[PDB]
Design a protein around this ligand. Sequence first.
Ligand SMILES: NC(=O)N[C@@H](CC(=O)O)C(=O)O
Ligand SMILES: NC(=O)N[C@@H](CC(=O)O)C(=O)O
Ligand SMILES: [Zn+2]
Ligand SMILES: [Zn+2]
Ligand SMILES: [Zn+2]
Ligand SMILES: [Zn+2]
Ligand SMILES: [Zn+2]
Ligand SMILES: [Zn+2]
Ligand SMILES: [Zn+2]
Ligand SMILES: [Zn+2]
Lengths: 362, 362
Amino acid sequence: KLVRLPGLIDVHVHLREPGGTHKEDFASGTAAALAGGITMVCAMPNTRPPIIDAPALALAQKLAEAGARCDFALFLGAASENAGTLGTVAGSAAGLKLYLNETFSELRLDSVVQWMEHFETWPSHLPIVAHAEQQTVAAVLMVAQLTQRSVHICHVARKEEILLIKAAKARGLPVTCEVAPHHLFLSHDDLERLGPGKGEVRPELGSRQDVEALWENMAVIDCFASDHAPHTLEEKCGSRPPPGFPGLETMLPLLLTAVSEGRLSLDDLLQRLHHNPRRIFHLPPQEDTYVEVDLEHEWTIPSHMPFSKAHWTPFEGQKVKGTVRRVVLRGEVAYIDGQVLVPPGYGQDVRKWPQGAVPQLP
Amino acid sequence: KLVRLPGLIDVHVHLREPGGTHKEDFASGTAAALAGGITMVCAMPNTRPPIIDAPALALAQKLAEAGARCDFALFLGAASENAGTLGTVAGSAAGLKLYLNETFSELRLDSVVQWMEHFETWPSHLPIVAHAEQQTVAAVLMVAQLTQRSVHICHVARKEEILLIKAAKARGLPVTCEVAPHHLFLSHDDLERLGPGKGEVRPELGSRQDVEALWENMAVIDCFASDHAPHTLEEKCGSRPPPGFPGLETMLPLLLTAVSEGRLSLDDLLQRLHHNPRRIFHLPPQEDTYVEVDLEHEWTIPSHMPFSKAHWTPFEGQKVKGTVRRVVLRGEVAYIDGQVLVPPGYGQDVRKWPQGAVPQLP
Ligand SMILES: NC(=O)N[C@@H](CC(=O)O)C(=O)O
Ligand SMILES: NC(=O)N[C@@H](CC(=O)O)C(=O)O
Ligand SMILES: [Zn+2]
Ligand SMILES: [Zn+2]
Ligand SMILES: [Zn+2]
Ligand SMILES: [Zn+2]
Ligand SMILES: [Zn+2]
Ligand SMILES: [Zn+2]
Ligand SMILES: [Zn+2]
Ligand SMILES: [Zn+2]
């Protein structure tokens, strides 16, 4: 007996095209999404070239329309030079992404004044998301208040961060957040097995107390999002390991395992992988789109999942219960039992759909 | 320049059919919905016969399928005799409605033990909503905790209630709520004009401080819902006035006026009349469905709106800015500039759509 889920949405993925296609491309990363029960992805802008201007966005749109197998929206990235220049193209993006800490990105921002300039110039009705760790969460919240608008915090990883966000929500402030599976299912206790190269990720793996705090504060977590961040094993284990884990293919199995154990409900999961992504990013419905899962199937995560070009996973050896059996996307069988059945280019840019524009006052 | 909104959802309406069709019927009440920019309604069970058993639900379903012009879901009502009897039909309903205070209903419940029995027997994945005023909010929240599940509070009207819910949300409890337009836009100050018969409503009109508290605590309000509760003028002004206001045709114009004044954003409105109704009640998308509004049109609410058989309104004389110009429902023009263009029976029971079933574990 299979359970029918709606089309799940991952608001934080790295698909590496353009410029990093040995790590992943639209075709492989969206194959990984479908096999993970994800029918729509929002792709981050820290590509090569980075998606920080209209020409780069135009290139990325065509690459995605030609390669993606599931539907998508593309983020724009904030830079030290582009505030006030994105107004014509802003509504065509998923949102604007700010990189406020050190990670796998060249998109620095040297001053909180540059953050303020982005919050002041980006259209006020369109999403802003931030990589903002520890005190940076409080700092970007201050900027959001000074400019009288909302902010969404990416990959919340620490007790410190979730409690800060909790306090802000208690004061009625417009902040939402997401949490990635590795910050719920891995911790410092896994660093010995992973080793120092594989274990590199930003935000770093937290303590057991960090993990426990995120679970205890599930009500504060608006979304789950993988932060699928593929790099090859050679890169992860070489002389300058880049931070990040692949995660599209493992996210839903890990979370289904937790549902089966009573750690959260099926509804809690569907709020965080479907309804709340829709409402925070004003992402449209996908007609005739659903995911069939088998909640009884027990299996062990292998050394690499089938699709991501990362060809490794930090969750190797974990026992899970729940698997994706079938995905239907806009009336076509997209995935069955390990076979992707829609070609590169089947996926579409949801921001071009009439129902995918973010509503605004004239 | 018109603004395109998604199809709005009203999770709390009284359509009076069966048994009260001089006040409203499915055809007139859903005409009123469309003219108010509402494309899906959830109809309360305090009809004659009340929708408290499978035969009554079967009757109501056929009446709604034949009369409704927009899409709908039907609530079941809790009674003193039906706990544990609704399991076969529960998933076909919008949810289960508990009447916990005195109002226009015969659906009493004499004991909190009966509340507990409903919370214990109703399927745990399906919505429960309550008419629960003042301390009754705290009491039903206690029952929800004892039985380890969620509850949604209907028509929150008082500072006392919104602050209680706020405290519960700060403790991570699974409670949501809605607010009706008359508790945002009318107060004790309007009782002299309305008079004692027209002014009868449950919850009663609040003080200026109650109204101010709901506005100040907008972040706590998950949904707007009209509690469209039509009665004729003769009934409202006769010897035993029933409580309730019609409200489908005035809700969106009143709220658009508030958006235009900067009291809440367009997004705040769309969360509360579209995204949050969807996610709390697991209501499906409506394909090719949207509402076009004119935000500049100023007008004064007349003594009765065109469609509701109530043929009166408590908002008469209020100046509003914003009007519904066009509604498209599932690819057909449903409403233009005062003309309803879909017949009775165009609307469908969204719980019968494959995408309209509430997901559950096997
Ligand atoms: N999280 C990571 O460790 N790496 C991400 C970037 C990010 O989300 O910061 C990547 O793109 O590799
Ligand atoms: N609110 C009212 O005053 N009346 C409503 C019932 C209700 O929502 O309690 C009605 O059905 O007339
Ligand atoms: Zn990041
Ligand atoms: Zn993110
Ligand atoms: Zn990232
Ligand atoms: Zn939206
Ligand atoms: Zn009521
Ligand atoms: Zn209600
Ligand atoms: Zn009611
Ligand atoms: Zn749902």
